[PDB]
Subunit: 388 residues, 4 copies
């Protein structure tokens, strides 16, 4: 109807309740479930759906062999009903490509897919399910974007892209789209030194993105965007509670304007909700691999370089595989505040489970509760041996 | 449009006509049908659908091994088109969890799913397909609810929950929700001594629930709710025609305010329509197991401790497996009265049929007729041997 | 919107064009297609769909063994998109039972399914997808109905039922329903001596049904109904071009008011369009079995006992299996006349092809053209050997 | 709402961006994907879908054996969601037949399917999903049409048909339909000597069709239609850049009004966008077989007999199989110009890959960009060996 405006603040997060879970790998053992990875969740004014990058083959299909690879001509951004698995028969293709983002502006949806060879990729921006704008690679080195939803404010939907090295300085740009057209773009500014896969959310006319510094940081870079002025700033989460992976053990003091050292050229897409005392960080339990997942309440994590946890909640046990994680919220829910939500990608198969030739995942998603709810762990649930 | 009000009385039940049957286990022998249990039926103003707790795997899938277990992280409340089987491709997830209830208030639907470990479960109340309220376990011992539809009156939808022992006194609460928010809750009152899995229906601004006294009763406890005053009473069906299972043989006089003895710590979800002479009780034919199913007209069963049958109808032969049963009605049908309906869960597999490693069910459902219709029996129809 | 009225006459039939074909058995060899039989086609104001009695199992499923049987608790009337096959995932259950009819009155649809044991069957009449009326068996000997669409005029939808012997006089009734309620019913009148499976159509406020005299007639009985006066007449098609099956060879003079002799206690559901010179009869090519299918223009067939063909069109070769056939028309099409249509059930499996343990069918459907179109034959197309 | 009018001109084509890709053969290796061929794409005012001629069997199905054949009673025009594969469960049958065309006029869709034996075929024209007009074969030698979308202007939708020899002069007709009824038809005029499978598009009240001269031409015949005057002209693309297949090597001067010689009695459906300097031609890279695919910017190709490429883009490598290609545009997109689009049919199986007994394809589709985008190649992606 009218463009949505980020007029509410976040609800108080006292715990996390189960929101969605598709048990895709369990079900796909004996049904036509597509192989995927890089999932996320995004809402329309009347529905919330699961999203992911399909690999263009079912898990039991022979073409599942080799799906550990990230970029192929057989990938596409698909969406499907909440908590259902991504099947051949219920998956709606939003666009073709191996890197994506998508968000609804209140009137209709914008989806972006990047495709092409490493030195000649291009982004196609779709709006109202039609292609509207295209952007060619500017650094000719894997043009790539969020892998989770973007956020809109009065028609303006900022999106973070990176083109260039994954192990040195790269060329990150913040594009401001409206109805799929480019209003403006700016090069990354601030103190974040490397940006990849931003996880964003909005509240009170401000959009916050927690990203991945693949080059040197084990703390996460943060980009805060003003969608009206179409400007931004960047820094790192100050807190010593490190949230990338792999990462060194937690120190007692973090870094606010530089990558916290110890691990180079690697990382995992992640997220956080930075809202004063109502601050919660997500991270893998393991400092070595994408194992387990927990939420930690770390008051003022963004600005306090000595901030430590005051509460927490385990989402996935350290004895279970996790993966990417990102933020989304139902901006069209009732009430006076936006309920923070996130999803965790539960990766199965290669490289951790190499008895199978494929790599896929299932999804688990939670939203915040003002109650202090009891906790459960939520594993993918499949038995690899069944696939042998 | 407007909240539905229970303005009609029940139609006269002179017999039962076939309403729906999904033949899920038969069909699922060679199609992607989800393993389920704890099914029910519930209507929206423009459609009636089947509901159940999925086990997050197909019947032929290898992950079907172990589905005799009731609570796992892979369960979810799903709904699907009337008389179709619950397939991977047509099942809509309403929420995640291992205990549920759901009902439409005339404007939109409220669904409730409980999840978590035994000592830390929580209920999430969804309204208009969005999470609205959460309730943490109060007795830290398997927070659980109806496993069949709730009933609404002018926006108020009462729901019965139990937390605590299944073999001694527990903490049952009646919650009064409106638009997914809690208006009030009260602890169970009256003479019912233990409450589990209430089966409810409404007529003339009163909601009647027939439940399961797992601890000591072979007669069924009854909770009658006033959704306007938001108050209730409880007692037992007085009739000597005992309807739980397992149960002792029928005596000549029942008990009105105490559990009828003979069988402890066990039972099955069941239901009844208590409307003076127009009273009909459902029960398994077997007093020992979930075998067979019959409807018995027992005038004034609720208040007459010597009431015996005056008419009956066999639904499932004693040589066929039955299971849970519950009430629902299409509150949005035409006419001057509400047509009583019920479903019977036809459980197949473990523990009765242990040649297979799974446990699932199909559904059969009937509604009342003012005619005196001929009767047929309605078995699940599948051949276990085909699954070997 | 408003009830449809049969205000148009039939279009001139100069030939038949292909309308729909689902290739169900071919496709079902490797997909989840339900076993069916007794199919038909019926239109809603905005869509035309295929209908049939499912057997509650897929063709490749092990439960397909035994589907030669006509009445079981696993059957149901299902409908699905035009020319798609009846799959587990796209079939919508209209009601439960082993004999049916269905028709749209312009506002909504009425569907009728009969179920139960041979001596205690009952019909449930659904309207607007809700059960409204029930009728108990009156002769306690396989209450049965059309197996093809009924026809409505200003809300009144007549339906022909038969209860009683299939090899002697039976009790046939014409019920006049409106909004699923019984307005009136009358016992069969006229000279038709036995009635089963009527195939009907309407034009100019008159409904014509061509049925099956199972007891003695090889010519087909005809019931003409006035839906306003709610009265009818019956006779036989006078023409010597005999259209039931099995049947004796064609004579030079038929019978107008009595069954044409030669074959007893057997037959096949069939149809015709009786409109003066614009008269076309359908029939199997074989006089011995349900083999082949042809349309013959037989001017004044209904009233001329010496009428012979003046034109024809082969639909299915005598070297291919056919089966039931019936009439339907899209009463909501544009133009000044109703275009006559029909379907032919292409039965595969038992008893003619007993190397497989199942019995199913596919559907082929045609409508009339005012052009004189070239002809093709339309076989089921499946290879039984593939199923071995 | 109102009939669409071709009021815009083509957007400037500076490159081609990926639009859709269904990876049908890859996915169908382990899911119920229908065997097809002769695909295309066509838009409705609110959705764009993939179209193709099904073979009435899945790829893994045993009935896939023999699908190299073009005309059978088991074929049908089906459509399905953009970039999804054509599955048994998501494919909507538009009509029955082995040659087709389809287009939306702004209000509703017209679909045409031709069926029958070679000497007695007939076309049935459907409008608003109902059969409206039928046309009998006029030359009794494989009545055939476009195999890609038609184009409408103010309700008038011209369609090119050919009946007669494929290796000598034939009888081509241009039919002008409106609401599925024939307004007028004319015999082919101009200098094109043989016409088959026209690929059309519209801009500024003119419809341009690039077809296939199967008899003698390696250059492509072009028919330009005035849908208001309902008249046309025909010629050949003058350019020496030859675009049919097989074909001789490119000369330095082409032919404007006669077939360019060198290859007889063969060809492939193809297309082009003829718009002055904004002219782009599609063609297989191989001059011998349906291998590879490229787009070439050939300014004034239609009228300049010496025109050579000034820019290009590879779509499919010469080491990958291609096939048919055709034009379509989303006439209902926003903006001031129509964005040129095309699809390429990626044929797999027989005759090029005869280790399998079937012939099918997948689809890849692109639209133009005003940017100069980097290029990628888009193969079908399946491994034939997996099917052995
Ligand atoms: C029923 O359900 C309820 C609701 O969930 C359950 O109650 C919950 O219980 C949780 C577990 O006990 C609890 O979560 C913990 O909260 C701690 C914060 O609370 C405590 O501190 C504050 C502040 O002084 C007090 O006010 C408060 O009262 C508590 O005492 C967190 O500190 C916990 O997280 C830390 O521990 C877990 C291991 O359990 C780690 O995985 C996590 O990463 C944290 O520890 C690491 O990081 C810190 C920060 O840098 C380091 O100091 C520390 O050494 C650890 O570092 C190592 O490990 C990390 C990760 O592997 C690695 O990166 C690093 O390098 C080091 O190797 C935890 O979050 C909930 O808050 C609580 N909720 C409520 C409402 O009560 C209840 O138990 C359930 N009931 C039953 C019967 O089960
Ligand atoms: C065509 O269709 C029609 C329509 O369905 C068919 O007609 C129906 O026929 C039914 C079966 O005959 C009939 O159902 C029975 O009705 C009895 C009530 O009617 C009779 O009593 C009244 C009152 O005096 C009379 O007015 C009336 O005229 C009749 O005489 C019920 O009593 C029957 O239920 C009892 O029997 C069945 C076994 O058949 C048990 O399964 C059931 O539980 C009841 O019996 C148990 O319970 C009582 C109550 O405590 C005990 O007293 C008794 O000993 C039994 O207890 C044992 O078993 C239970 C269960 O296992 C166990 O818990 C306990 O411990 C003990 O071990 C039955 O309901 C329909 O009413 C009738 N309908 C109509 C409209 O006529 C017709 O036959 C069909 N035609 C054909 C040709 O098939
Ligand atoms: C391109 O397509 C066009 C369009 O379809 C093709 O043209 C069509 O060709 C058809 C076949 O030739 C033709 O159909 C036949 O029409 C006959 C009627 O036309 C003739 O008679 C009239 C009247 O005098 C003339 O005006 C007219 O010009 C013709 O001469 C029918 O009589 C035909 O049906 C009879 O024959 C077929 C066998 O071919 C039987 O299957 C059928 O049942 C009819 O014969 C039986 O029944 C009669 C009636 O009782 C008996 O008299 C007779 O002995 C047969 O009885 C035996 O068989 C039956 C069935 O098994 C059994 O029950 C009984 O006991 C006996 O054993 C036939 O319908 C179309 O009308 C014609 N259409 C047009 C517009 O022209 C064209 O050929 C195609 N082109 C190519 C190149 O292929
Ligand atoms: C990142 O992406 C960008 C964007 O895609 C990439 O840049 C693109 O690069 C393309 C390949 O280099 C280029 O495409 C070529 O363009 C040529 C036209 O440009 C040139 O000429 C003009 C005019 O003088 C100049 O202005 C311009 O600057 C260039 O110099 C075309 O001529 C090319 O097509 C010809 O070559 C290809 C083989 O590469 C053939 O397949 C094709 O059919 C053409 O050649 C045949 O046909 C002609 C015409 O008759 C004959 O003269 C010739 O001998 C060939 O004939 C044989 O082969 C055919 C086919 O098999 C057969 O039928 C015949 O009988 C003969 O056997 C080609 O289209 C893009 O334009 C360019 N785009 C842009 C915006 O720059 C960039 O490289 C990528 N970056 C990286 C790092 O990869
Ligand atoms: C979001 O905020 C903008 C204010 O900028 C609102 O957009 C005014 O809205 C009315 C109705 O659409 C128009 O008459 C104005 O011209 C609108 N736009 C602007 C840019 O001034 C918008 O309505 C708000 N969204 C919601 C849901 O209230
Ligand atoms: C079919 O015929 C009946 C005439 O009997 C029409 O029903 C009059 O229609 C208007 C609008 O619905 C009302 O004000 C009258 O009272 C209607 N009914 C009767 C029974 O008199 C009906 O509209 C016709 N159907 C169509 C499509 O025109
Ligand atoms: C466009 C692309 O390839 N994205 C990939 C991303 C990228 O490699 C990383 O951001 C370092 N540059 O890494 C991962 C990953 O599981 O780690 C998966 C993504 O598919
Ligand atoms: C929440 C839960 O576990 N419910 C289970 C219920 C419960 O055990 C009983 O109410 C006794 N407490 O029993 C049964 C059962 O088939 O008997 C199945 C339910 O899944
Ligand atoms: C209700 C019922 O059984 N109908 C059956 C019908 C019936 O036997 C016949 O009308 C003679 N009475 O016959 C046939 C048949 O293929 O011949 C199939 C139907 O399923
Ligand atoms: C109606 C029909 O058969 N069309 C066929 C067409 C035709 O043979 C050609 O136009 C020469 N006449 O050829 C091809 C082909 O792959 O080459 C496929 C089409 O199915
Ligand atoms: C089918 O059922 C019959 C009868 O029970 C049995 O003899 C036969 O072996 C069965 N065949 C299969 C393939 O199940
Ligand atoms: Ca399968
Ligand atoms: Ca890092
Ligand atoms: Ca009990
Ligand atoms: Ca007969
Ligand atoms: Ca040629």
């Amino acid at each position: 109807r009218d463009f949505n405006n980020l007029t509410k603040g976040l609800c108080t997060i006292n715990s996390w309740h189960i929101y969605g879970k598709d048990n895709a790998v369990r079900i796909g053992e004996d049904s036509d479930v597509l192989v995927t990875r890089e999932p996320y969740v995004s809402c329309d004014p009347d529905e919330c759906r699961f999203y992911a990058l399909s690999q263009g083959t079912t898990i039991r299909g022979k073409h599942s062999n080799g799906t550990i690879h990230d970029r192929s001509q057989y990938r596409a951004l698909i969406s499907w009903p909440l908590s259902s698995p991504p099947t051949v028969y219920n998956s709606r293709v939003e666009c073709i490509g191996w890197s994506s983002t998508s968000c609804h502006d209140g009137k209709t949806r914008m989806s972006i897919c990047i495709s092409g060879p490493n030195n000649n990729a291009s982004a196609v921006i779709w709006y109202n399910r039609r292609p509207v704008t295209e952007i060619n690679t500017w650094a000719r080195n894997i043009l790539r974007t969020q892998e989770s939803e973007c956020v809109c404010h009065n028609g303006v939907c900022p999106v973070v892209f990176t083109d260039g090295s994954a192990t040195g300085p790269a060329e990150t740009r913040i594009y401001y789209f409206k109805e799929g057209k480019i209003l403006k773009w700016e090069p990354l500014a601030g103190t974040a030194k490397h940006i990849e896969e931003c996880s964003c959310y909005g509240e009170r006319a401000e959009i916050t993105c927690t990203c991945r510094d693949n080059w040197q940081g084990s703390n996460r870079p943060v980009i805060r965007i003003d969608p009206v002025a179409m400007t931004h700033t960047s820094q790192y989460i100050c807190s010593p509670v490190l949230t990338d992976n792999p990462r060194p053990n937690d120190p007692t003091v973090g870094k606010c304007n530089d990558p916290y050292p110890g691990n180079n050229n690697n990382g995992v897409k992640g997220f956080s909700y930075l809202d004063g005392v109502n601050t919660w960080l997500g991270r893998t339990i393991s400092i070595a691999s994408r194992s387990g997942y927990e939420m930690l309440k770390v008051p003022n994590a963004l600005t306090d370089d000595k901030s430590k946890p005051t509460q927490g909640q385990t989402i996935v046990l350290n004895t279970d595989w996790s993966g990417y994680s990102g933020s989304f919220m139902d901006y069209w829910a009732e009430g006076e505040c936006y309920r923070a939500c996130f999803y965790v990608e539960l990766i199965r198969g290669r490289p951790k489970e190499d008895k199978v030739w494929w790599t896929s995942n299932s999804i688990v998603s939670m939203c915040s509760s003002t109650e202090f709810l009891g906790q459960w762990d939520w594993p993918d649930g499949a038995k690899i041996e069944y696939f042998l």
